[PDB]
Amino acid sequence: MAYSTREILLALCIRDSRVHGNGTLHPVLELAARETPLRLSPEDTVVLRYHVLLEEIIERNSETFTETWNRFITHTEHVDLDFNSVFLEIFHRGDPSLGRALAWMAWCMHACRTLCCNQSTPYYVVDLSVRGMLEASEGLDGWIHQQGGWSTLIEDNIPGDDDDLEHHHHHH
Length: 172
Known about the structure:
Elements: H1 8-18, H2 45-60, H3 62-72, H4 81-89, H5 99-117, H6 122-137, H7 140-145, H8 153-156
């Protein structure tokens, strides 16, 4: 027996729906893909912790996240060919591995709030992204394993202690 990481996404999802579901659960994460759910309390520690860990991150890399999204922007509008690259590039600015998954759920959080708040791309556009995004989310299972499971992020809160100032030669 082993608690698959695909569960942490289950809760993070339900919350991502309420966060925007002012008064009532927002239809931007009501029935992604899973019928007859197993008896479980989607309110564990790691799950909740993530809701935060991710939001907090945005406070630092808020523009970064969205920024990348605008860069790759301009796709077929009907192919995951760009949705996968974006999934990992959405936080490319960072560095860590799993950090791409933490940002994904992070930026996606504020991104949905802004997309819904502003009188544009109503629940129809916000949901659209989720439909495709959620699909890629399932990738975190193995995609996360290679990263080292949340066990690393959802605790020490991502390791950091390196950057220096060497790479180019434009400014002395």
